[PDB]
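pipeline/complex-builder :: batch 7 item 3
reading input block
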Amino acid sequence: TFNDVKTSLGITESYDIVNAIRNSQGDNFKSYVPLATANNVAEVGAG
Amino acid sequence: TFNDVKTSLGITESYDIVNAIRNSQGDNFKSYVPLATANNVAEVGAGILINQTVQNDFITSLVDRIGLVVIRQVSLNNPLKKFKKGQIPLGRTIEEIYTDITKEKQYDAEEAEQKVFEREMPNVKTLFHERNRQGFYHQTIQDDSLKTAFVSWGNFESFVSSIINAIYNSAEVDEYEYMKLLVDNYYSKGLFTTVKIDEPTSSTGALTEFVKKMRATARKLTLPQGSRDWNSMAVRTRSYMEDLHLIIDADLEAELDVDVLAKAFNMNRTDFLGNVTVIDGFASTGLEAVLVDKDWFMVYDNLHKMETVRNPRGLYWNYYYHVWQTLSVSRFANAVAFVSGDVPAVTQVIVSPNIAAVKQGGQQQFTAYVRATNAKDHKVVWSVEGGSTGTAITGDGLLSVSGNEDNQLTVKATVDIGTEDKPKLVVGEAVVSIR
Amino acid sequence: IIDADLEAELDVDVLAKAFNMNRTDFLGNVTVIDGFASTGLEAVLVDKDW
Amino acid sequence: YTDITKEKQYDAEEAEQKVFEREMPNVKTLFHERNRQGFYHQTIQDDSLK
């Protein structure tokens, strides 16, 4: 029983992909903007 | 997906048994010291509200897994279901008819000359009942979303079936609560005949005093001459003994069998006459027991359909279960009320024609039946509202009608209970046609 | 001629918790009515020729 | 365990908009875990008991 676990636990976020899609004015991440559930695949997608 | 939650969520602790075991040192918890794993049982053993992924003891990276899933299927029935009359396919209203006894006339061979051919109408009271309850039970099953909670199809089919039964359990429970409402509708309108008692819980004498009034009343319903005393339409009706139903709660049956029928040598002399129906309770203040005929209820079914629909977008079914029925009460049947509170001195005044058609210029006799709960005088005062010029009801209720009356009349009879400062009238009314 | 108040009170208070029914029963043929329209009159003994 | 529901009044004026309304079942769960985990120990020297 560990009871205070966050999803990160080892992660040095190099650039925070959640804000990176949310700020895309037409750069590289503008292909990740018409995805619906991109926030959820980004949240737990690394296992 | 919660947080730091505890195994102590919904627990108002009494005394910390873990402390009380180890610091017994003489107390009666010293049967628990040789139990080795007692702290583990005394922490989880109540049941955990919120599941936590417990790590394995040997290899901590493994998660301890759900080994058996238990679905607790239960059934709720209706106690008062046996009082249900039948069902109605077509038509809304039910008409009851009761013919009543009539008036003696003196012999007179002098007046019988021209009056061979005079006519008397029979004293017939009727009564009507409409469909009342019109309702449905609705709950959704999102079939594809609950596949995550179930690793098996057995636990998937038993759980979805348990959502079906919670609709049919909502039938038998909510229908039970309307028949507790018809009792508390009838008592709230003053249509039960109130038999004022004391509370049976306080004295065993007040329990046996209560058994006296019920067995007194259950014989008065069953005399072969009837009475006008126990209807709210005041007709001569005899209840048969086997149709009397007593609707005590559960507390008074335990007082009965332990304070009285335990120690009585003869149970046939202190039981409850008629039939005993044990329920939750009564919403009214002090309405402790109720005795009725079996034909007091006019409960009839109308409609029982299960209707289904599917949302393709959100991937769910909605189950609609429509329960329509006529829920009503015969006022032509005997029904009493064993009320332990302070009751009013008069509950109900009944006028013996509720429906009269008086020819313009003709006369009609009107008749109070004051349901005094005490044994006092309770003067009845008569009046006619809506009358144009004269129309003059007087005395015992002999109605007059003028030659120029065309209006519909309301004939009132009233009784003044309590003090004149706060008058609090009790009024019975009649409806008079004019031709 | 027993008013139904007194019949129930004979059964509850007296003929129950008693081992001998013939030793407390009301002497005579008991006929039960709903009560007399009078004041305080409860029961009535009469002969058959009354 | 799955609990009973609430009744709704028949009305075809509100049945126009709410055919796909979503009303949630009242399911409650408990969880019971393994709690007792212990052993009993008893030695027998056969030959010196002879």
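note: The first strand of chain D starts at residue 2 and ends at 3.
queue -> next item
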